[PDB]
């Protein structure tokens with residue numbers, strides 16, 4: 001039935017947000033106010049493509 | 058007796074012709090209907106023997122709290 005295409009491990013590397021859930025929650029409102037545009041772009045890509053491999057960037 | 062109680066042979070002759078035509082057409086139609094029934098039940102591509110499938114109008118085409126449905 002064909003093979004499954006998967007990204008390489010090197011393609012999956014990115015600088016990580018390594019703050020705990022309390023830190024994220026304390027800044028959640030301002031974070032959603034400031035970083036809205038890239039997050040909305042990512043969510044639109046995610047819900048339109050229906051494939052996690054097409055919204056890595 | 059012939060003049061009072063009976064008709065000429067042509068009436069019975071041509072009535073027989075009409076009856077034979079009707080009966081032969083009915084026999085051909087019966088055979089054709091049997092063949093059509095067989096083909097329609099075998100293939101399912103005609104008006105007959107149409108069995109219900111799920112209505113596609115029942116599907117919800119909305120975002121589903123998860124991008125991948």
Ligand SMILES: CCCCCCCCCCCCCCCCC[C@@H](O)O[C@H](CO[C@H](O)CCCCCCCCCCCCCCC)COP(=O)(O)OCC[N+](C)(C)C
Nearest residue numbers: 058059060061062063064065066067068069070071072073
């Ligand atoms: C005269 C002496 C020498 C010759 C004797 C010959 C004997 C013949 C008499 C006996 C009667 C024969 C039997 C009758 C069968 C005929 C029935 C039917 O097939 O005929 C119909 C004809 O109907 C007649 O009305 C038949 C009447 C006969 C009924 C007999 C009744 C006798 C009862 C006795 C009663 C006496 C007194 C009683 C006291 C209480 C046809 O209808 P129709 O749709 O047009 O056909 C089209 C053909 N055309 C175009 C030529 C006209």
